[PDB]
Design a protein around this ligand. Structure first.
Ligand SMILES: Cc1cc2nc3c(=O)[nH]c(=O)nc-3n(C[C@H](O)[C@H](O)[C@H](O)COP(=O)(O)O)c2cc1C
Ligand SMILES: Cc1cc2nc3c(=O)[nH]c(=O)nc-3n(C[C@H](O)[C@H](O)[C@H](O)COP(=O)(O)O)c2cc1C
Ligand SMILES: Cc1cc2nc3c(=O)[nH]c(=O)nc-3n(C[C@H](O)[C@H](O)[C@H](O)COP(=O)(O)O)c2cc1C
Ligand SMILES: Cc1cc2nc3c(=O)[nH]c(=O)nc-3n(C[C@H](O)[C@H](O)[C@H](O)COP(=O)(O)O)c2cc1C
Lengths: 332, 332, 332, 332
């Protein structure tokens, strides 16, 4: 595999069509899904030349851990849909690559099993039925050694996925929510923040005022994100709001971005627009579907090579230098 | 049906080609027809998160009536072209859905029959031959219980519909103007305003100065509209003028928009740009053609679900909140 | 025929391919030829409503003559390439329609014969070999009753037409320059201006400073024009420079535009951007090829209908009102 | 051949596919390769009219030599891949055309042999293993009569060429680096500048601050360039940074540009944006592949004709006049 696109072809071969569609699809007309890619393709980097590259490093420090790349595996529910080893295959490859893995509330293997793989994981939270029950999931995650709570804040309910409706898609009986919902509010965020000393990361922020309020609320990070085009159809891509958000929070929390990251060059673009790190969702699942744990290992090795290549060609010996690169919008 | 586009396919199947073309077509090269869709597709919404959604409501108050959605059925002439029950099927479904229905001057069932369906309808006026005759239509509508006069102001004469010319299209002998024209001016508006206490809504405004003059003229609303691309070919889409118009009228009248609204997400975009409500034309006729009254019921149920979904995913418990959303223009 | 595009199809049927290419083609990669259309398609008009349309007139006064439309037939060399009656067929139809016809220096019928058709024609000048010889052509035109000299200023030599090179195109032996070249300069303009009291119109101006200098030089008009994409490939379309030029000349001369005008709506766009009138080139030749004089008559009747339709739908009772319309750039 | 595109078709016919791909390809998704063309196609020139064209000249003075055109042959490694005479065929044609030829560090004929062809060549430097060894290459070039050192500064290592990876491409055993690498820094530039009195030209500058620093470093020129889309994928095209760079250096060094120049009109656009001259890479190799030395001669004759045509149609008797032309960005 020499690009992330090789793995999508491989995953489309192997998966049942309705599972490929569950993975690939967005809500509505998929305008926001498409716009995530169009928005990244319009961004051009202005590289710097002739800088010292003797010790290029792609490492970052985030939420009190060193990560090998400015990247984490996005939360993706029900990974046994894609491969029998599901979350354990992905988490093992992420650990070995030095990349944080986000354990999902809707994981198809229990969060304690996935956390036992090691690799200092994160835990993604959907607000439940109940404050008390939500907080038990948080405490479970913390007790199991998760290092951050990624609170998803853009899913008061799930978006309308027309592919899934047209397919009549439902979980196979062999895929269950192994850890076993009400709309979250800022009060829910405060309840979580009071319940844990782990950093709380709010995933699904797009409005500048919501990024500022996240800082004021004591979030340790946000993920600027339209949920891969799966929630509001017509929501702006995160990458289009990232620069304005980074300026507004003025270093008050980590600012991650996701949606359409498909190469180390895209990682570089996100960094140059100010992101602390990116999440990568669908490509990780393509690699899982294509070749299990080894597939995800090859994907993360390929991304690491592409990030290092892009950084050095742009004159950046560190991710901090990459955040100081300038960009130019072009027409595609 | 899971999208408005499913119904267009169904209507294209059933209608004679020349009737489908009468419905689908625009004037000239159909530049303005296409631009209505392109303009909406360029608009992205910036959703808000973590707001209270305990009692999301899509209702609005407009022209002294509560409506179930920020939407009305646009005036579309000669609806017996599309289904034998014509206007009565549409008006019955609109009533049952709580959505205003606009009775046309060129309806193929008399306005008194359609008004007897109930549902507090509106009446669309074309200026006639004569001030005295125009005012009789207005008084008829008011006597029959119509609640607003939608005065069409963009049709001094009808635009040049090349599909209809190429088809040699004419009304079947079984379709007639059951209520039975000179260019309207601001004097005509004043004559109507003096003749009725119903709110007068000027449909087909695109220039900012004309929206201000409509307020000064005592209009209770305007519809920002290029008539579905059927009048001047090369007229700007209403959605491109809406924000400037809303700012100029500064709450002095209701500001509706139409042209290309094809989902609850599009309704949300129009609201976020400042519209009080939208009109929907061709999709209602697709549903009528596809399945009569039941077809229109299913369309309005689908739109209601999509509007509620879009509002809540954008953090809006009310249409007023949706009007306070910000938008971003993207490239598509 | 219900659009200018119907006539292009008809002309492509009848003409030899290499003659169709001589007519249709541009220089280089035809970037400027294509851009003339793209530039017009991006322009949207903001129509006004509810104005008095009791006496809509498309007439203008230009160069001391009333014209029926804000339009003239562009200079197109060698019209016997397209039909045996050549220039005489076109000039007769233009006369009957009340539209100025531009007699070409390279006409395939002598300028005195074409002028004898009547209709108060204009004469297009290419600068010759010699000041004395150029001025004799001017005097010939004036003696024959031409009413303006259209001095082409964008052809120091002819552009590189790759279609013609690939075809090995040359004039049939039955087509000759019946009136029988050095680069023109501002000194040439002054020599012409001193030799005639007819208005001198400089055709092929694109730079704002050249439009101002044309006024200072005593031009009575300019044509803002990239010569139909046939001269510099990569020259900006005239329609993209028109508004800036109209503002710069501040009424000091007539400002015409050409390039890609293909409907009455396009005429309206050019007027709304400030043009006094347009020229139309290739469509006139399509109609000539398709059906001789009668073909050109039908084209001019169709354009007249489309101009009147567009003006009235935009609320303009006169071309002056149309010049006061505002426009909005859109994306197509 | 009437356009550069004719030669690409001819080269694609004759070359082995994997050699055509080595030549044609870029890094990554080839976004920057494509953007070089898209960026040029968006630029329109505003031509001037009626200027004296009695002695149009395309000559420039650069690095102390008169050149016949504002153009040089770009450095392209391993030209025996494309034709058996390789660099000698190209250098002979360049000499005969009066166009500088850039001898590559990775030439497949030794730099002394190519320099013996004559024509006052330039020498392109890749920084080596060692300061001492790099400086020996520079001194070799100077001793052989090269007139400028083109130091490539955008290749700390080579970009990831996916076509070459997919093809498993490697040099034929009959193609070698006949002159026989560490990342260059500003210290390397200073070492070169101190070692030679020849002008040092830094090739691969895109950031404005790097262009200013190049002047401060004593560069005699820069080439604003993303290396033909072969280095960082997502690097901005040089033509998009050229105007800002020309303004920033304020005449302190020559500013060349490359990437996608495919006609004399493109040369004119680059000049109008402020370039001193352009480099042309792939088209020269197409002509070499198609027809050896004679092929390159025909290409350079065609470019010379197109540059002279474009200049005169734009009213420029000299390249200096062309740099004073204004441009307008359009949509394509
Ligand atoms: C199949 C699928 C399942 C997902 N499940 C969740 C989830 O349970 N929680 C969540 O916060 N995000 C979920 N996401 C969104 C991802 O975390 C991420 O925001 C989106 O996929 C990132 O975009 P990318 O896939 O383009 O890289 C899911 C995404 C996909 C494709
Ligand atoms: C077939 C047809 C007939 C129409 N008849 C009228 C009419 O009689 N009066 C009027 O004001 N608008 C008329 N309209 C315009 C609609 O009210 C509305 O402005 C346009 O259709 C809205 O756009 P949409 O169809 O894209 O939703 C008609 C539209 C169509 C398609
Ligand atoms: C076949 C052909 C011949 C032309 N000959 C002349 C000419 O002799 N003199 C001149 O000023 N313009 C000439 N023109 C340019 C037209 O006057 C006009 O600028 C261009 O065609 C207008 O664009 P349109 O064809 O898109 O309407 C010619 C155009 C064509 C297509
Ligand atoms: C096959 C190939 C080999 C190249 N080798 C070199 C090289 O050794 N050194 C260098 O500075 N540029 C090299 N270049 C880049 C060119 O000098 C130039 O920047 C790029 O090709 C210019 O773009 P164009 O090919 O679109 O005209 C190479 C380009 C190609 C296509």
């Amino acid at each position: 595999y020499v690009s992330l696109a090789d793995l999508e072809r491989a995953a489309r071969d192997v998966l049942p069509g309705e599972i490929f569609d569950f993975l690939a699809g967005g809500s509505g007309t998929e305008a926001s899904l498409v716009a995530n890619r169009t928005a990244l393709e319009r961004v051009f980097v202005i590289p710097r030349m002739l800088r010292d590259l003797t010790d290029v490093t792609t490492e970052i420090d985030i939420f009190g851990r060193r990560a090998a790349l400015p990247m984490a595996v996005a939360p993706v529910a029900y990974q046994r849909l894609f491969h029998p080893e599901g979350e354990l295959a992905v988490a093992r490859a992420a650990r070995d690559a030095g990349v944080p893995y986000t354990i999902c509330t809707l994981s198809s293997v229990s969060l304690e099993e996935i956390a036992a793989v090691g690799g200092r994981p994160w835990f993604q939270l959907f607000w439940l039925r109940d404050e008390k029950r939500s907080l038990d999931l948080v405490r479970r995650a913390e007790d199991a050694g998760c290092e951050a709570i990624v609170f998803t804040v853009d899913v008061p309910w799930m978006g309308r996925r027309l592919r899934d409706m047209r397919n009549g898609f439902a979980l196979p009986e062999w895929v269950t929510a192994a850890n076993f919902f009400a709309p979250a509010t800022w009060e829910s965020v405060e309840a979580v923040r009071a319940h844990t000393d782990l950093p709380v990361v709010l995933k699904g922020i797009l409005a500048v005022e919501d990024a500022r309020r996240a800082v004021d609320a004591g979030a340790g990070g946000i993920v600027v994100s339209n949920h891969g085009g799966r929630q509001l159809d017509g929501a702006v891509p995160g990458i289009e709001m990232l620069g304005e958000i980074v300026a507004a929070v003025s270093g008050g929390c980590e600012v991650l971005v996701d949606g359409g990251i498909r190469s180390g060059g895209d990682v570089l673009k996100a960094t140059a627009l100010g992101a602390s790190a990116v999440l990568v969702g669908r490509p990780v699942m393509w690699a899982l579907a294509a070749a299990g744990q080894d597939g995800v290992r090859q994907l993360l090795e390929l991304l690491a090579e592409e990030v290092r290549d892009a950084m050095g060609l742009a004159g950046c010996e560190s991710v901090g230098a990459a955040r100081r690169l300038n960009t130019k919008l072009g027409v595609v």
